[PDB]
Design a binder for this molecule. Structure first.
Ligand SMILES: [Mg+2]
Ligand SMILES: [Mg+2]
Ligand SMILES: [Mg+2]
Ligand SMILES: [Mg+2]
Ligand SMILES: [Mg+2]
Ligand SMILES: [Mg+2]
Ligand SMILES: [Mg+2]
Lengths: 55, 94, 142, 59
RNA sequence: AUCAACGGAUAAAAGUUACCCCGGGGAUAACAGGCUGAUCUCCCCCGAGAGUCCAUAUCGGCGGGGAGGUUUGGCACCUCGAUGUCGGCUCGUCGCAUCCUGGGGCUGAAGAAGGUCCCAAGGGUUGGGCUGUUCGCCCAUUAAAGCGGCACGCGAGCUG
RNA sequence: GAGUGACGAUGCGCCGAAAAUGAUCGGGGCUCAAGUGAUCUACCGAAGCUAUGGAUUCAACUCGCGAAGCGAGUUGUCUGGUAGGGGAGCGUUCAGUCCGCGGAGAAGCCAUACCGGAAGGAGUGGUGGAGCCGACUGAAGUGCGGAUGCCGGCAUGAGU
RNA sequence: GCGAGAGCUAACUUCCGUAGCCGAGAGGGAAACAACCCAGACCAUCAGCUAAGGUCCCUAAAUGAUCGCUCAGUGGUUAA
RNA sequence: AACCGAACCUGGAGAUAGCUAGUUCUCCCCGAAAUGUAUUGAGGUACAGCCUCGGAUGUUGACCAUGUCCUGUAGAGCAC
RNA sequence: UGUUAUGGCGUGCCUAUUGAAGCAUGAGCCGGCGACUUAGACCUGACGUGCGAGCUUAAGUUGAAAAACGGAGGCGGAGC
């Protein structure tokens, strides 16, 4: 699953900032290839709105 | 420009970002994005058919600027020096 | 490195207000006066054309001429020094109706103020040829 | 200042900045962007060529 | 051990200051401004009923909806290394929710005299007796003797 | 001789809609939409992301060196900041040691476009007229814009 | 902002809970404007893409395209 | 003896001052708190919470998923 | 390098604060003066050196363009 940070963590709740950290994203634009497992899929759903998700 | 120029120029000695190839000669080739060197008005990739040659002239340091930063009533004052590293290149090219 | 200045070029232009809605005519003038297609294109100085206006009297106005469109000149210390004309009431000085729309759309600085000197308004048609001894290239609105 | 000198010339040939730059984007080949205003200011003949090229890649 | 002021200062303890003093506080009150608008001022909806009869010429029970910011407040935001405070006088200017004049509609408007509402801020809006008075009551007039804002307008302008 | 009427729903608009220095949606001006519902691209736009160069923090991976430990060296990574904590240094006086300098011109003063990542430090000229840089180590009465700060000189108010 | 009490389902009010920002946060936007929207500034560039916001003229960029609505300047003061 | 709710001068004396002011070169790294309990306490202070530096441990921390237990709010209901 | 015109941008400094261009505080200007120190055979921690299961001396004595002597005493060494 291709993930990219499109929105800033500033002004977003602690947990959502903590999730974006767990996904390995540090800057807006940071894109990475991601695992298709309940835990990794769950993190991505938890910051769904801050990310541009491919497939 | 954003390092690695272009355009029809008449063989001038312009200054750009550092080029690694030390001393004189070194020789550099540039893609070219537009030209009028022969009245032919050609642009983009069709300009890539052509390539400008330029010789490295001098490696240098820019004029001394001072980084001054200040925030009121928060006792914040910062003075730090700066000099921008460059490369002078004499254009020759096709 | 970007391109520098040339001034020895003052271009005169004739614009007709007839039936043109004020604001829409104003925009055109205000733009040619500052720099639209711009000669050297630089903002540091006055590059704009000179705009002569004809038939100032016949300028168009929508829902309100007699209504709402109110000029509001408010005089020296306000010992009730609050004077106000209607737009129909500018059957007095119509050459001002264009002027106040144009200056209104121009910068307000030292240079800006020197810009109104380039706007020459006249209420007639074939007769306003006063400030028309130099060139006078005619430009229609749209 | 550059953007200003651009749709000043783009409009001179019946175009505009929004439109002219979109064409030069569509004709990928054009990556000019920087010093596209010098062409507009100093070389009109050459600037037309770019307006013509943009009009094509768009329509 | 009502060490109950309950983590309990000494075994052992009240007042007063306009004769007051120092260190501070706009961390906190009085004035004024600010936010609010309960209270206050005004306007509007409805129509019980009053009006010989007829709700609406006038008046409007019980109830309802707003406006204003002139009252008493609420709150405590700049000002406590100082923003002088009532009333008079002097000098003005502004709002109109108009006291007089000006124009109108309705009238339970014959006329004359009016009532009420609409438009209207151009000018005008008296002199005294009582009280520090603002106010208010009174005398004598008047076209009328308006209501409110301007730090409850105005003390580097005067009074006190 | 042709459709005509009553309830309701809902979009946008109308009345209701009076405040004190001069008015206004920021203005100009806009319905010949520059208002407003729905849709669609395109461009502008930040210190955000990117390009190119360069420095720092930590970390692992090389090698200098009798060993840590610290140099350099790539690659990744970091670097908004008040109280505060930690690190590396600049500058002044005095001292000890070394190296020197000076009447063919010391310090101090004055000017300056040069250097260093900063505190800072040189070159040159001018003035001065007899003392004095640089380095290593030691020690402090060691760095000022504030304190209604202290001393002194000189301004403003004013040719009042 | 949300969840409550006090208050008049007043206050730029007070007092808890909770999330964010300011405090200690520069930069764009909101005319101006600690806080709201966007976004967290290592330094240099007369390069490029975007966000929130924008694209008549002041003022960067469509006086864009289609079907509609509103003629009151409504837009650019609230109610029965 | 030109300021008397207790004169003046010198000393104790650098009284005390939970208060006001002031606190001076540079760059680099991290970076708070205005909360809890107690207090003749309430603009003071103790301990904790939160910062930083050195050391030890060295994945125990963070987010997300699955499993499992706990709860009487929102809604709702009328059996008390 | 000095100066100048026009254009863009642009709310002195310090202090005190939730919040300062603030019509809150301070300051006429310049020069100089001017605020975290010193003591203690005191306690506790870092770093460094010397010896090391041991480590040190105090007063003093003797020399001194200079240091030697002096184990009285002090600390580790066993706790409850
Ligand atoms: Mg008050
Ligand atoms: Mg008073
Ligand atoms: Mg006065
Ligand atoms: Mg001073
Ligand atoms: Mg209501
Ligand atoms: Mg004292
Ligand atoms: Mg004070």
């Amino acid at each position: 699953m291709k993930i990219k940070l499109v929105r800033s963590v500033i002004g977003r709740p602690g947990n959502q900032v903590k999730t974006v950290q767990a996904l390995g994203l540090r800057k807006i634009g940071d894109s990475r290839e991601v695992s298709d497992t309940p835990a990794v899929r769950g993190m991505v759903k938890t910051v769904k709105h801050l990310l541009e998700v491919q497939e | 420009i954003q390092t690695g120029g272009k355009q029809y120029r008449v063989s001038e000695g312009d200054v750009i970002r550092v080029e690694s190839l030390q001393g004189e000669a070194g020789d550099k080739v540039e893609l070219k994005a537009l030209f009028v060197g022969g009245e032919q008005t050609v642009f983009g990739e069709d300009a890539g058919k052509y390539t400008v040659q330029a010789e490295v002239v001098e490696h240098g340091r820019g004029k001394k600027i001072y980084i001054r930063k200040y925030k009121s009533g928060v006792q914040y004052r910062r003075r730090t020096g700066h000099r921008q590293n460059f490369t002078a290149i004499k254009i020759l090219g096709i | 490195k970007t391109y520098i200045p040339k001034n020895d070029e003052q271009n005169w232009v004739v614009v007709d207000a007839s039936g043109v809605p004020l604001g829409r005519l104003a925009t055109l003038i205000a733009s040619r006066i500052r720099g639209k297609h711009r000669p050297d294109f630089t903002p540091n100085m006055i590059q704009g054309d000179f705009v002569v206006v004809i038939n100032a009297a016949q300028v168009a106005l929508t829902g309100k001429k007699l209504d709402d469109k109110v000029y509001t000149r408010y005089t020296g210390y306000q010992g009730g020094l609050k004077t106000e004309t209607a737009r129909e009431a500018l059957s007095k000085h119509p050459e001002r109706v264009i002027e106040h729309a144009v200056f209104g759309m121009l910068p307000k600085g030292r240079q800006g103020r020197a810009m109104h000197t380039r706007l020459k308004v006249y209420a007639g048609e074939t007769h306003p040829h006063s400030a028309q001894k130099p060139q006078v290239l005619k430009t229609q609105p749209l | 200042l550059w953007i200003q000198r651009i749709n000043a010339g783009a409009r001179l040939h019946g175009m505009n900045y929004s439109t002219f730059i979109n064409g030069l984007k569509r004709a990928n080949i054009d990556l000019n962007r920087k010093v596209l205003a010098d062409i507009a200011a100093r070389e009109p003949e050459a600037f037309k060529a770019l307006v013509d090229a943009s009009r094509n890649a768009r329509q």
